[PDB]
Design a protein around this ligand. Structure first.
Ligand SMILES: *[C@@H]1O[C@H](CO)[C@@H](O[C@@H]2O[C@H](CO)[C@@H](O)[C@H](O)[C@H]2NC(C)=O)[C@H](O)[C@H]1NC(C)=O
Ligand SMILES: *[C@@H]1O[C@H](CO)[C@@H](O[C@@H]2O[C@H](CO)[C@@H](O)[C@H](O)[C@H]2NC(C)=O)[C@H](O)[C@H]1NC(C)=O
Ligand SMILES: *[C@@H]1O[C@H](CO)[C@@H](O[C@@H]2O[C@H](CO)[C@@H](O)[C@H](O)[C@H]2NC(C)=O)[C@H](O)[C@H]1NC(C)=O
Ligand SMILES: *[C@@H]1O[C@H](CO)[C@@H](O[C@@H]2O[C@H](CO)[C@@H](O)[C@H](O)[C@H]2NC(C)=O)[C@H](O)[C@H]1NC(C)=O
Ligand SMILES: *[C@@H]1O[C@H](CO)[C@@H](O[C@@H]2O[C@H](CO)[C@@H](O)[C@H](O)[C@H]2NC(C)=O)[C@H](O)[C@H]1NC(C)=O
Ligand SMILES: *[C@@H]1O[C@H](CO)[C@@H](O[C@@H]2O[C@H](CO)[C@@H](O)[C@H](O)[C@H]2NC(C)=O)[C@H](O)[C@H]1NC(C)=O
Ligand SMILES: *[C@@H]1O[C@H](CO)[C@@H](O[C@@H]2O[C@H](CO)[C@@H](O)[C@H](O)[C@H]2NC(C)=O)[C@H](O)[C@H]1NC(C)=O
Ligand SMILES: *[C@@H]1O[C@H](CO)[C@@H](O[C@@H]2O[C@H](CO)[C@@H](O)[C@H](O)[C@H]2NC(C)=O)[C@H](O)[C@H]1NC(C)=O
Ligand SMILES: *[C@@H]1O[C@H](CO)[C@@H](O[C@@H]2O[C@H](CO)[C@@H](O)[C@H](O)[C@H]2NC(C)=O)[C@H](O)[C@H]1NC(C)=O
Ligand SMILES: *[C@@H]1O[C@H](CO)[C@@H](O[C@@H]2O[C@H](CO)[C@@H](O)[C@H](O)[C@H]2NC(C)=O)[C@H](O)[C@H]1NC(C)=O
Ligand SMILES: *[C@@H]1O[C@H](CO)[C@@H](O[C@@H]2O[C@H](CO)[C@@H](O)[C@H](O)[C@H]2NC(C)=O)[C@H](O)[C@H]1NC(C)=O
Ligand SMILES: *[C@@H]1O[C@H](CO)[C@@H](O)[C@H](O)[C@H]1NC(C)=O
Ligand SMILES: *[C@@H]1O[C@H](CO)[C@@H](O)[C@H](O)[C@H]1NC(C)=O
Ligand SMILES: *[C@@H]1O[C@H](CO)[C@@H](O)[C@H](O)[C@H]1NC(C)=O
Ligand SMILES: *[C@@H]1O[C@H](CO)[C@@H](O)[C@H](O)[C@H]1NC(C)=O
Ligand SMILES: *[C@@H]1O[C@H](CO)[C@@H](O)[C@H](O)[C@H]1NC(C)=O
Ligand SMILES: *[C@@H]1O[C@H](CO)[C@@H](O)[C@H](O)[C@H]1NC(C)=O
Ligand SMILES: *[C@@H]1O[C@H](CO)[C@@H](O)[C@H](O)[C@H]1NC(C)=O
Lengths: 583, 169, 703
């Protein structure tokens, strides 16, 4: 060819000047007879202005550029031969980029069982090929270089030596400058990230049910690093983690005893280790290990109650002993059986063993002293006493001021304590139905409670016959029966209206009561509506306590149609139609 | 030069004590070499303990001053490095015995630490062959004795470092 | 006799291999070359202990010195020997008297170096043996040393005392313990208390390379591989190298390979097709060798093809270009082309020399195809190459099938309002996405003034306002490529109100028996359409194209529900694409009971009878064709006179039934009534399935 372009690899920082040359050899100069005057510089196949083109000698021409912005500039010097024929001589590509900056954030981490890894941030984009080399050396020896293959992180090839200070730094070099960051002097033992402990085992204690001893093993580089741990524990239903005080787990150890735990409850544990001196980095969380606490003696004795059916004319009376099981929060384990003891204050104790919830025994007419206590694997519960008085005792003290009202979908019942010392309160309730008897449901409350809600699965639009019976030290108190509703609703069907008598200008109207399963609430009034074929609608209202009601303003020889509806607190429902003749 | 071994002295002393306690352990280099060369017979262990290389005793190291002690440690570590290099050039098997490279790196680290400690005290340290083997049993016995003496010397140096840390005059 | 007495000149030793080199000549020879037999006798510790007798026959010439060697099991530095040889001639052609000559002098073979009174020696030192061989170790102690006891690693050794100051140790079938050797420590009981001994190096047995096979890739390199077997390399400077030599015969080329189970052979130019190799594994003990024989062209493993490029020369045709690497014109590759799309796979066979193509045909438009190409040897198949995957998508094309059209005209504002309906095209019938539809309506009275309308997808209905003049419409689909074949339809002067006969048919649950009578003999086909006759809906005009040679066809549709009437209209298309109304049909899929009863009203009331009447019912918005009316009167004393059916009621009443035959009459009069009475009744229609719903009784009072 005619020559080359100097420089061959033009790299100029954005915001500066640039000037290139294109020398022509004498061979092609004599062959084509085209001097340096017919040259036409082309940048990306575009004609350049003649103002920036200047010739210096017979075989050299120069062009200038001010503040190039285009990153990839294809500079080609071409001569124009005879006949306006353009011929290419040489072509190069000019790059535009600014030099890099001083790197920062020089940190290094040493994983357990791996080489040292260092990272840093590059900063800004240089738009050019830039290599990052990581240097490392001791005070008297040098180590091989870490050339970043991709990105910014670089993993060294040598094995880390502990207890020896090392100084590292990274140098950034490109086609426009070389700059090195600041050096850091650290100890490879203070940057170790240990592996999470494994084989975590949770063991309970038969003597102390409120403790859970932990057991785990740590690598510690073969016993070189004294590692302190962080223990977190939680239940199986909660999502938050409760952390033990870190001061208690500062000494190097492989076991810890967690105290103040709930008996007969499962827990989940996890642990992570770090160097004793507080330096380095916290390890990842270990595998979750499960552990169940040991059982313990139950705290509260189960609820107890008795029911006696009327059996007149017999020496022995049949009594049905009933009692409920303890929840998993108070039983502290699996209930095995329930023990009962009966004695009439003077005889021997008769012991039974019933694994169920009920027991029926035949007792005589004298006073009995019963005792019930749930038995567990480790021991028995408290002995709850409930005597049985003789059938010839009349209750002298009863409860007063009984009232119930539904609030927040809960039927709350309140009462006033009797002037005598009571031991506990018993509440009983069941649905009211005239087609089938109700099931017996009960609950036991302490003596200090005077207002509570029914703990059970109640149904709306149903009448619940609530009964409260106080329990004294010598026997139960009075028994009163009240009625209440949880969520009243309109009745399903209206009352059947019949005519008892008809007269010349007067007529009484009768009706039947709405059944309990059909009331769906407490009745308040009764609406009687009547109208003839051409007359106007007239509505009268009568109270629920009335059954017969005489209708006035009745004309003779007129057909009349009556309609009666029953309205409750949640609306009303119309009844069937009836028509009577007035003679 | 000034690109390492910062002015902290207590950290350097702690590092030296830890390195001495780590190196002065028969499980590091002696026991693997004994289990590798099939020298588990009690008579072979007695022959190992009999032939011992003359190393500086504990009383001699305790009687010397601090700079002389540092110089003696430097020279002894240099001799140990030379002997380990000779054993490596005679064994002709690198992959089956990495404890040699581990001990070599540990000795180099101890040498760097003691040089930095000597520089901190404004003291100037003193600045200064056949591959084939006719017999193998004598070479094994000599290497065993040298390793035993080296472990004893490392233990003595660790005890002297502990005494120095206790004194701290 | 000729005293052929051999004379020993020089004797040498070799302590490393335990060999005794012996040279001797005979001066009593007269001829130039004769065959001789040299009987050799060896002694030990004195000249009277014969331990070995051998016969060595070798032709000896004039002045030629005879060389012979012997191996001793015990080390030579422990005990001396004595050797004497005599000659004998095997002259079976002359002088048949083979008499032995005189015995030579006892040449003392001494190799005992020295011994110190306070030291001891042991031989041999660092012996390399094979696993399973024997060895004899000698030990020589001084004069002061007493009660020497040698031991293995941990066991006693029963040594034999060959002489007063030496002891022999014999080891049988030595086993491999470790690559570092088995230490033999021997400590003296009395005298100097120390430990001395040597290491016994035991090596494994060298195995033969197994499954030695080689291959070629580009006619330039041969990557031959084998199995090395068990490693037999020691740790000290005794045994280090285990070389593998592969040396061909026709080329005489072989060098030590740098790997253990692989080697990359470089073939020289010349197009030589023959190979005869010999792999050899050798160590310091033995040397194993294995020979293989193969051909260059019979073990070719072609690589993945290169220069893979695809071009589209149409929606149904495409070329597949690729290039492979071939050395020689005779070597042709047998490639396999694989065209896969969706679940269908199309494969074939192709043979190429250096580069060829495969013209695909019958490709489906708007479908992505994936090409898979691999090659292998044609004649002597060895292995298959790797699959080359290339994906491409074919372009779209204008549709080719005609779109069926239909219209619905009526009279509104004095102008002929026409509504054009069209069904959406299928996937393979459209050959692309439908963009819009072109509507070209041409008038016969003015063919120059033509209107152009564009209905964009997915609209399926449009309204046009035209007069009573006959128009000619043209509908086609327009996609991103071109236009579809247009359908021809023309309008006539008919207003659509042609009075034809009405026929009622009984439809099937999922079919209809549509039968039309032909009126002309020159027709091109029929078109039928139906609308769901209901109250508050706009019917979806559904139609189908039939031929001119059919008369009855059963239609199928899932939208047909019982309770709605479909008014079928049969249109006949003449040769001029003119549709004429010929027949009208109507029917129900399944007739059900009526849903609404007509309102009853009494026009007149007499003390002995009463008249009943109701307005006309809707015969178009019902669930079935009404055949009549069923009335049910209720009274307390009236009797059911014929033809009224009597039915008793448990309420002590009377119930008379009247089936009003005919859906036309709406007036009925019942007689036999008594005045000042009470009467109840209710009216309801009935269909072929049953009567309507039972309503309440109308309250009427007869004076
Ligand atoms: C060198 O380039 C110059 C252009 O500057 C040219 O020289 C001209 O040559 C012609 C004829 O040879 C003369 O008439 C002109 O006076 C010269 N000068 C100019 C400015 O045109 C030519 O292209 C080259 N020179 C030669 C001798 O070939
Ligand atoms: C005209 O100017 C060019 C550059 O503008 C110069 O050419 C140089 O010639 C010398 C002589 O051999 C070379 O060593 C240099 O490499 C050339 N380039 C440069 C940039 O110096 C020179 O000043 C003139 N050229 C001629 C042929 O006279
Ligand atoms: C070098 O770059 C500078 C930009 O700072 C330019 O120098 C002047 O630029 C202005 C505007 O383009 C021109 O009008 C002047 O003629 C330039 N020269 C001077 C001396 O002011 C220019 O791009 C480059 N300078 C030169 C001398 O080439
Ligand atoms: C300096 O840059 C580093 C980026 O290497 C950042 O430091 C940590 O970087 C890791 C991974 O990039 C993050 O997970 C951490 O959250 C970062 N912070 C800390 C405190 O570890 C960070 O951008 C800079 N560090 C500082 C101390 O400014
Ligand atoms: C009869 O009782 C019904 C409901 O028990 C009453 O109807 C409600 O009256 C209260 C005002 O007292 C208002 O909430 C509404 O007017 C009615 N509500 C609903 C849900 O019906 C009725 O007013 C009572 N009649 C008389 C005469 O007191
Ligand atoms: C001299 O040679 C004779 C011939 O073999 C050997 O004498 C044997 O000596 C042992 C030593 O007690 C006897 O047990 C044998 O019975 C002798 N005879 C043989 C045939 O073995 C021996 O090689 C030499 N003599 C001595 C004393 O070593
Ligand atoms: C090692 O020594 C044993 C025992 O001295 C020898 O085993 C002999 O093997 C041959 C060949 O099988 C048998 O004919 C002999 O009977 C064996 N016994 C003896 C006493 O000769 C043999 O010298 C060596 N054995 C091997 C396996 O190398
Ligand atoms: C096995 O291969 C090795 C390595 O290529 C070679 O060992 C050479 O042996 C000769 C003769 O003893 C020496 O002069 C060379 O220095 C050795 N090394 C080399 C690289 O040539 C030889 O080819 C084989 N050696 C044995 C013992 O079989
Ligand atoms: C093929 O290779 C084999 C093995 O390398 C060789 O076969 C030898 O052929 C000669 C000539 O008949 C025999 O004397 C040898 O005994 C054979 N074996 C060996 C190991 O040399 C020879 O190089 C080639 N054989 C042929 C027939 O071409
Ligand atoms: C090995 O390949 C070569 C060439 O590919 C072939 O060798 C032929 O062997 C036959 C049998 O003796 C000869 O008649 C031919 O002259 C040989 N050359 C050719 C080009 O055919 C053959 O395919 C293979 N050799 C054998 C023995 O099967
Ligand atoms: C695909 O099919 C045709 C039919 O072979 C291809 O034709 C090749 O065209 C090139 C270019 O001229 C020739 O060099 C080849 O010899 C032709 N034949 C083959 C087998 O490659 C062509 O590549 C494709 N068709 C079109 C229209 O491009
Ligand atoms: C950077 O590294 C590449 C190799 O990844 C090398 O080719 C180049 O010369 C190096 N230097 C520069 C300035 O790019
Ligand atoms: C940890 O448990 C695993 C199996 O669960 C088993 O390797 C071993 O019991 C324990 N490992 C160690 C190193 O203690
Ligand atoms: C309890 O004893 C009485 C005694 O008459 C008798 O009813 C029966 O034996 C027992 N009661 C029941 C219900 O079994
Ligand atoms: C004897 O050994 C020599 C040299 O080792 C040599 O001539 C050959 O190997 C042997 N000669 C005979 C005749 O066996
Ligand atoms: C040599 O042998 C011959 C006969 O074999 C006989 O003279 C004698 O045994 C020997 N002669 C001498 C001089 O030793
Ligand atoms: C073939 O070589 C392979 C080694 O990868 C192995 O299956 C075996 O050595 C050979 N096959 C047989 C049947 O020997
Ligand atoms: C190619 O030929 C082979 C053998 O002749 C046979 O499998 C078939 O004919 C072709 N291959 C396929 C996949 O069709």
């Amino acid at each position: 060819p005619c020559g080359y372009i100097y420089p061959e690899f033009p790299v100029v920082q954005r915001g500066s000047n640039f000037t290139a040359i294109c020398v022509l050899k004498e061979a092609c100069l004599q062959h084509y007879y085209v001097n340096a005057s017919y040259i036409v510089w082309k940048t990306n196949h575009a004609a350049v202005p003649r103002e920036q083109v200047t010739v210096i000698n017979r075989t050299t021409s120069s062009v200038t550029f001010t503040d190039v912005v285009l990153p990839s500039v294809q500079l080609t010097c071409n001569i124009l031969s005879f006949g306006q024929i353009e011929q290419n001589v040489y072509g190069v590509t000019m790059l535009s980029g600014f030099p890099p900056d001083k790197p920062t954030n020089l940190t290094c981490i040493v994983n357990e069982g791996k080489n040292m890894l260092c990272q840093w941030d590059p900063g800004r984009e240089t738009y050019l090929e830039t290599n990052y080399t990581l240097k490392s050396e001791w005070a008297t020896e040098k180590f091989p270089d870490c050339q970043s293959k991709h990105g910014t992180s670089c993993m060294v090839s040598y094995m880390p030596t502990y207890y020896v200070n090392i100084e590292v730094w990274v140098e950034a070099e490109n086609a426009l400058g070389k700059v090195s960051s600041e050096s850091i002097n650290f100890d490879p033992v203070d940057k170790v990230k240990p592996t999470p402990p494994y084989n975590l085992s949770v063991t309970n204690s038969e003597e102390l049910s409120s403790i859970l001893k932990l057991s785990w093993v740590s690598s510690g580089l073969g016993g070189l690093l004294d590692l302190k741990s962080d223990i977190q524990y939680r239940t199986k239903d909660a999502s938050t983690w409760i952390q033990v005080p870190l001061e208690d787990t500062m000494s190097p150890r492989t076991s810890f005893t967690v105290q103040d735990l709930k008996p007969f409850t499962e827990y989940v544990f996890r642990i992570r280790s770090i160097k004793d001196s507080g330096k380095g980095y916290w390890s990842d969380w270990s595998e979750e290990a499960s552990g169940t606490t040991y059982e313990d003696r139950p705290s509260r004795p189960p609820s107890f109650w008795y029911k006696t059916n009327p059996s007149h004319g017999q020496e022995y009376r049949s009594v049905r002993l009933i009692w409920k099981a303890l929840p998993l929060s108070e039983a502290n384990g699996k209930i095995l059986d329930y023990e009962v003891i009966l004695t009439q204050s003077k005889s021997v104790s008769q012991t039974y063993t019933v694994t169920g919830t009920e027991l029926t025994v035949n007792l005589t007419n004298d006073r009995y002293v019963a005792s019930l206590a749930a038995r567990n694997k480790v021991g028995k519960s408290a002995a709850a006493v409930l005597t049985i008085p003789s059938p010839h005792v009349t209750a002298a003290y009863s409860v007063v001021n009984l009232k119930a009202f539904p609030k927040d979908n809960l039927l709350w019942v309140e009462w006033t304590p009797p002037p005598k010392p009571v031991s506990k309160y018993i509440l009983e309730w069941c649905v009211l139905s005239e087609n089938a008897p109700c099931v017996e449901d009960w609950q036991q409350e302490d003596a200090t409670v005077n207002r509570t809600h029914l703990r059970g699965r109640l149904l709306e639009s149903k009448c619940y016959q609530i009964t409260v019976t106080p329990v004294f030290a010598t026997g139960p108190g009075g028994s009163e029966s009240l009625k209440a509703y949880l969520k009243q609703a309109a009745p399903a069907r209206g009352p059947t209206v019949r005519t008892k008598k008809v007269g010349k200008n007067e007529a009484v109207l009768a009706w039947d009561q709405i059944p309990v399963d059909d009331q769906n609430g407490f009745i308040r009034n009764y609406s009687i509506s009547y109208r003839t074929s051409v007359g106007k609608e007239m509505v009268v209202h009568v109270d629920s306590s009335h059954t017969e009601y005489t209708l006035s303003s009745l004309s003779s020889d007129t057909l009349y149609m009556v309609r009666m509806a029953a309205y409750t607190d949640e609306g009303g429902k119309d009844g069937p139609e009836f028509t009577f003749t007035t003679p | 030069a000034n690109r390492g071994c910062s002015n902290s002295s207590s950290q350097l002393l702690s590092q030296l004590q830890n390195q001495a306690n780590l190196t002065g352990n028969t499980e590091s280099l002696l026991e693997p070499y004994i289990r590798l060369q099939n020298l588990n017979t009690p008579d072979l262990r007695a022959a190992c303990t009999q032939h011992s290389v003359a190393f500086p005793s504990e009383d001699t190291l305790r009687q010397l001053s601090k700079p002389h002690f540092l110089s003696t440690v430097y020279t002894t570590l240099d001799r140990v490095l030379y002997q380990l290099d000779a054993l490596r050039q005679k064994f002709l098997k690198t992959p089956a015995f990495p404890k040699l490279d581990s001990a070599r790196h540990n000795i180099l680290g101890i040498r760097n630490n003691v040089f930095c400690m000597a520089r901190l005290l404004n003291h100037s340290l003193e600045i200064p062959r056949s591959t084939t083997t006719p017999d193998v049993f004598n070479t094994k016995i000599g290497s065993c004795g040298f390793l035993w003496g080296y472990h004893r010397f490392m233990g003595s140096v660790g005890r002297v470092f502990r005494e120095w840390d206790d004194g701290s005059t | 006799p000729l005293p052929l007495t051999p004379e020993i000149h020089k004797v040498s030793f070799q302590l490393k291999l335990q060999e005794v080199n012996l040279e001797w000549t005979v001066p009593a020879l007269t001829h130039e070359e004769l065959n001789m037999i040299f009987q050799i006798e060896i002694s030990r510790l004195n000249i009277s202990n014969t331990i070995w007798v051998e016969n060595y026959s070798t032709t000896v010439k004039r002045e030629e010195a005879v060389r012979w060697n012997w191996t001793s099991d015990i080390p030579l530095e422990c005990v001396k020997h004595f050797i004497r040889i005599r000659a004998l001639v095997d002259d079976t052609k002359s002088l048949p008297q083979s008499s032995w000559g005189n015995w030579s002098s006892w040449k003392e073979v001494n190799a005992k170096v020295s011994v110190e009174p306070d030291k001891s020696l042991i031989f041999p030192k660092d012996k390399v043996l094979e696993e399973g061989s024997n060895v004899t170790i000698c030990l020589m102690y001084g004069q002061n040393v007493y009660n020497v006891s040698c031991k293995l690693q941990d066991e006693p050794i029963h040594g034999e005392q060959l002489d007063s100051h030496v002891s022999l140790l014999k080891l049988n079938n030595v086993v491999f313990l470790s690559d570092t050797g088995t230490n033999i420590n021997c400590q003296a009981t009395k005298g100097p208390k120390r430990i001395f001994g040597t290491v016994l190096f035991v090596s494994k047995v060298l195995e033969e390379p197994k499954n030695v096979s080689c291959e070629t890739r580009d006619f330039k390199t041969l990557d031959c591989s084998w199995e090395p077997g068990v490693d037999t390399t020691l740790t000290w400077r005794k045994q280090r190298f285990q070389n593998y030599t592969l040396c061909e015969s026709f080329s005489k080329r072989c060098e030590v390979s740098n790997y253990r189970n692989s080697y990359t052979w470089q073939i020289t130019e010349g197009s030589q097709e023959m190979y005869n190799f010999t792999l050899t594994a050798e160590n310091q003990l033995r040397k194993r060798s294995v020979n293989i024989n193969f051909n260059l062209t019979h073990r070719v493993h072609p690589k993945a093809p290169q220069d893979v490029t695809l071009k589209i020369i149409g929606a149904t045709k495409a070329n597949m270009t690729w290039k492979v690497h071939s050395h020689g014109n005779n070597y042709t590759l047998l490639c396999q082309v694989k065209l896969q799309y969706g679940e269908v796979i199309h494969e074939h066979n192709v043979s190429v020399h250096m580069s060829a193509n495969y013209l695909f045909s019958d490709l489906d438009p708007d479908t992505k195809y994936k090409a898979f190409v691999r090659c292998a040897s044609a004649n002597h198949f060895w292995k298959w190459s790797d699959w080359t995957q290339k994906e491409f998508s074919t372009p779209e094309t204008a549709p080719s099938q005609a779109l069926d059209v239909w219209r619905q005209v009526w009279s509104e504002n004095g102008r002929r309002i026409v509504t054009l309906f069209w069904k959406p095209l299928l996937k393979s019938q459209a050959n692309g996405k439908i963009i819009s539809y072109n509507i070209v309506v041409e008038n016969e009275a003015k063919p120059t003034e033509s209107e152009h309308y564009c209905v964009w997808a997915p609209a399926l209905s449009t309204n046009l306002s035209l007069d009573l003049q006959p128009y000619k419409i043209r509908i086609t689909t327009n996609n991103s490529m071109g236009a579809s074949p247009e359908s021809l339809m023309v309008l006539s002067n008919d207003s659509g109100h042609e009075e034809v006969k009405e026929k009622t048919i009984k439809g099937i649950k999922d079919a209809f028996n549509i039968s039309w009578e032909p009126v002309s003999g020159d027709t091109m086909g029929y078109v039928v359409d139906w609308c769901a006759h209901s109250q508050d809906q706009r019917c979806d005009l559904q139609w189908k194209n039939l031929g001119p040679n059919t008369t009855s066809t059963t239609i199928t549709s899932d939208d047909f529900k019982p309770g709605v009437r479909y008014n079928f209209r049969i249109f006949e298309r003449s040769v001029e694409h003119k549709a004429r109304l010929v027949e009208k049909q109507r029917g129900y899929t399944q007739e059900l009971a009526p849903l609404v009863n007509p309102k009853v009203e009494i026009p007149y009331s007499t003390p002995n009878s009463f008249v009943l009447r109701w307005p006309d019912y809707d015969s178009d918005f019902q669930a079935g064709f009404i055949k009549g009316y069923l009335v049910y009167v209720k009274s307390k004393e009236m009797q059911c006179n014929q033809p009224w059916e009597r039915t008793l009621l448990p309420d002590n009443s009377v119930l008379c039934k009247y089936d009003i035959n005919g859906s036309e009459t709406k007036t009925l009069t019942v007689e036999n009534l008594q005045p000042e009475s009470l009467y109840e009744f209710f009216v309801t229609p009935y269909t072929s399935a049953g009567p309507g719903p039972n309503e309440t009784f109308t309250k009427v009072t007869t004076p």
